[PDB]
Amino acid sequence: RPTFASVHGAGQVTEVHAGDLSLDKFIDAATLAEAPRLPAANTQVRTVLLTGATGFLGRYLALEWLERMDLVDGKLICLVRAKSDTEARARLDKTFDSGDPELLAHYRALAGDHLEVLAGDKGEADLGLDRQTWQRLADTVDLIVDPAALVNHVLPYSQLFGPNALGTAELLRLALTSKIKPYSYTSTIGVADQIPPSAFTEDADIRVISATRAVDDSYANGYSNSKWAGEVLLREAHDLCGLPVAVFRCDMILADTTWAGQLNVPDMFTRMILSLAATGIAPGSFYELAADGARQRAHYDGLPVEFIAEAISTLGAQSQDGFHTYHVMNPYDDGIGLDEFVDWLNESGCPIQRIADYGDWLQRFETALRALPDRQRHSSLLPLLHNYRQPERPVRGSIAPTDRFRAAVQEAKIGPDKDIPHVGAPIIVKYVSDLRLLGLL
Numbered sequence: 001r002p003t004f005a006s007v008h009g010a011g012q013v014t015e016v017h018a019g020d021l022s023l024d025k026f027i028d029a030a031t032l033a034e035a036p037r038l039p040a041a042n043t044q045v046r047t048v049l050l051t052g053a054t055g056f057l058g059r060y061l062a063l064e065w066l067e068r069m070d071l072v073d074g075k076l077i078c079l080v081r082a083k084s085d086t087e088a089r090a091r092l093d094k095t096f097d098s099g100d101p102e103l104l105a106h107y108r109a110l111a112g113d114h115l116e117v118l119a120g121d122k123g124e125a126d127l128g129l130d131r132q133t134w135q136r137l138a139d140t141v142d143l144i145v146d147p148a149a150l151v152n153h154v155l156p157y158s159q160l161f162g163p164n165a166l167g168t169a170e171l172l173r174l175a176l177t178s179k180i181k182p183y184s185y186t187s188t189i190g191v192a193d194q195i196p197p198s199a200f201t202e203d204a205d206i207r208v209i210s211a212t213r214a215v216d217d218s219y220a221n222g223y224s225n226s227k228w229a230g231e232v233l234l235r236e237a238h239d240l241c242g243l244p245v246a247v248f249r250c251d252m253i254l255a256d257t258t259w260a261g262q263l264n265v266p267d268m269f270t271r272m273i274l275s276l277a278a279t280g281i282a283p284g285s286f287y288e289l290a291a292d293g294a295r296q297r298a299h300y301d302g303l304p305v306e307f308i309a310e311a312i313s314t315l316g317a318q319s320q321d322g323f324h325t326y327h328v329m330n331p332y333d334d335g336i337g338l339d340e341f342v343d344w345l346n347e348s349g350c351p352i353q354r355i356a357d358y359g360d361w362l363q364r365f366e367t368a369l370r371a372l373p374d375r376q377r378h379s380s381l382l383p384l385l386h387n388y389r390q391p392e393r394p395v396r397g398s399i400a401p402t403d404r405f406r407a408a409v410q411e412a413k414i415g416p417d418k419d420i421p422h423v424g425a426p427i428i429v430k431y432v433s434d435l436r437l438l439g440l441l
Contacts, residue, residue, distance in 0.1 A: 002169070014215055021165070031173065036240060039179055042142060045074070050065055056264035059262070074114065078117045122168075123162040139179070141174065146168070146183065146186070147312075150223075152223055168229070183243060183246075187248065187249045189328075246319070253267075257430050276345065277350050280351055281368060282352050288394065304423070329400050330398060331406065336424075369381065379440055
């Protein structure tokens, strides 16, 4: 099998190059030679392969695809990690049994005729699948939707290579066999960590603007490198056979209001809301104060999960030809930041008082967190407090450009706003109600 050492280490690896991620290292010559000669899958999608359905964004994508497949009497095939197909199906079923009877009924009804779950692993040859089954997927899948990844901000690229880079290449083997398949991929806006902002855009070829990258100790260095590698491989595949590709660079994915009991508990944002609610204390401002000591206008760049899933699905690779990259970010200079979230929590009846001095708040906050019972404390912000030692510098809008994504969302009239949504009080309040349902508050 291809490995991080084999691909990038041909001393230790201190830098990686886009050029090293050539398809010949991952895919056999016969497949590569044949790919440009193959026919395309039917433009009308009737079979979808979705990875990461047990994930937070992934489960929302599974609902979108189950609904879409229900329209056309089609099939959704989900690749899930488990020791057997039966166990894999049980894991997915559990994902949707969260204390919301309506969600459970909706999933069950759709799943009965439109869902197939296969146990597998992206890092393994043939996705860990039986060869005949892999061939069936190659023959029948009309779209690959691939949000699965190991999302870990502290691990090195050497360890994230298998699930995130090699895993992309394995899916590409499928996309390049029998019939050419559109591929929708989620990346991270964090790939910009090593790219000059003046050069970073949606339209750019990632291989050109990020040809060489460092391997080091900076935050999320490994994770961002791993996601970049998947984008590079997709670019190589597109040059080879023209497969339609949609890359969605995401960041903060928030909970949403339709279904109860659905949160990404370990996520830093979830931990922050639980912590504020449980302790009842917030700082005068989460952000740097102005010269006159006033609270400054700020914006929290995050988007609710249902909107993101709908956008990835509607604007994805099956929707048009070519290679398209989108920045799934909240671009508004709307004044809705962490301080506003605290105010919304209070308006909802969750009493949170402000401690004016940031340092004073931080010490009181750590003490209060330490005093919480184990179940709350374990899911709190305490293990991540080092990230909050200083107040945040406020930003008006997003750090990333969103011109292509916003225009596409507006053109497709996605969601209630027919545009990228703002974050509102219901999103924040949903964290509290869900935390209560889950037993954390």
